[PDB]
Design a protein around this ligand. Structure first.
Ligand code: NAG
Ligand code: NAG
Ligand code: NAG
Ligand code: NAG
Ligand code: NAG
Lengths: 50, 49, 39, 148, 98
């Protein structure tokens, strides 16, 4: 007889920006703007003159 | 600044005399603003303006 | 490229329901933790 | 939107409640993201009374025109999605109504072509007050709707 | 200290370019949220379009996303629709009476 169903769910999503809305419950994100520099002149593979 | 021209405020030609030491959050300068009285110009004057 | 704002994002999948056709919480109105592999 | 019943008592154009104002709710959201915030101050690189030098003045005019061509290009793309972003809300209510009306009256309908359900039992005004406000008993009237 | 006039032009051009790239930054994201909703939708109908085809005269459509199988079904019967091995010719004499 009846054989019931649905789909998944999880318990934490986080904010985003749409065109028409602010701060939805969306599962992930990742930054698109990098803020964290490496505070040293990384110069492997290039002969370098400081 | 009306008839004063904005580079005259550091020279003070005879129409900028009410303006020599002003203080503003909005400066306004007019088409009839002649920066000088004796005829001449400032060199590199758009950097100065 | 330099930018003014300090965070911009992405996703992987679904807007979340706690327990442009209307499928996420529609007439199937609800979710799970029943199956645990897919969605 | 609307609710409408009609019977052997009368005729009425009513509202069906659980989304009827909600055509403000994403409709309030579009507009301030769109009528957005401008915060950068731009200085006076050139003079309209007397004559910046021709070469930089050409570079300024070429850069301003190039920038003008960019912002003007960007102007006409923002609008075309908002027309699209209005059609879906009629669509996402249309199926919403469609998905609602086939669930509360279970063995009491055949699907129409005009957007109108044929109720498989007797229905007067006290019966009109059951599906409109989510108080219909779709267990109690099913012995007599199978024969109709 | 680059010279003030070109330095103004550079700063104005960089700020103008900055305003362009920053404007372009916030438009890329809003479609990807939209590009995730459809995949739940395009699976939702996919499941909906699958479940009404393999069991032909054996269902009435629900409101909860659940089919009511019009015949007897134990575990060996559970192994027919799940992996595309259901015989929807063989069980139809008894599903019409149920
Ligand atoms: C979300 O993104 C993070 C980024 O590190 C990743 O580790 C994770 O697997 C992604 N998915 C979920 C469901 O968190
Ligand atoms: C730049 O274009 C303006 C029109 O906006 C024009 O009046 C001006 O003469 C041009 N400048 C030069 C240096 O060609
Ligand atoms: C209909 O539903 C409302 C709540 O939505 C309830 O207060 C009311 O008693 C119901 N019946 C009628 C006849 O309005
Ligand atoms: C250009 O802007 C920078 C800030 O990024 C400032 O430090 C610099 O003094 C400006 N240059 C000129 C010539 O005004
Ligand atoms: C179900 O289908 C698989 C192939 O998808 C098949 O190998 C298997 O024998 C079928 N039956 C059961 C009971 O798993």
């Amino acid at each position: 007889d009846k054989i019931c169903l649905g789909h998944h769910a999880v318990s934490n999503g986080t904010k985003v920006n749409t065109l028409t809305e602010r701060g939805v419950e969306v599962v992930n994100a990742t930054e698109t703007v990098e803020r964290t520099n490496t505070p040293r002149i990384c110069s492997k593979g290039k002969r370098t003159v400081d | 600044l009306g008839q004063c021209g904005l580079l005259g405020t550091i020279t003070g030609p005879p129409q900028c005399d009410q303006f020599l030491e002003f203080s503003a959050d909005l400066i306004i300068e007019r088409r009839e603003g002649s920066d000088v009285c004796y005829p001449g110009k400032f060199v590199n004057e758009e950097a100065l303006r | 490229r330099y930018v003014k704002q300090r965070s911009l994002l992405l996703a992987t999948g679904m807007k979340n329901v706690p327990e442009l056709f209307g499928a996420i919480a529609g007439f199937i109105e609800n979710g799970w933790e029943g199956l645990i592999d897919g969605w | 939107y609307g609710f409408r019943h009609q019977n052997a008592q009368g005729e009425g154009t009513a509202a069906d409640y659980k989304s009827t104002q909600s055509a403000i709710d994403q409709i309030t959201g579009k507009l301030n993201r769109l009528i957005a915030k401008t915060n950068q101050q731009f200085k006076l690189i050139d003079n309209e009374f007397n004559e910046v030098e021709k070469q930089i003045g050409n570079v300024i005019n070429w850069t301003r025109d190039s920038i003008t061509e960019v912002w003007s290009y960007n102007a006409e793309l923002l609008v075309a999605m908002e027309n699209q972003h209005t059609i879906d809300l009629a669509d996402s209510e249309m199926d919403k109504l469609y998905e609602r009306v086939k669930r509360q009256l279970r063995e009491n309908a055949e699907e129409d072509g005009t957007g109108c359900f044929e109720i498989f039992h007797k229905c007067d005004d006290d019966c009109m007050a059951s599906i409109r406000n989510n108080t219909y008993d779709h267990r109690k009237y099913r012995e007599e709707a199978m024969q109709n």
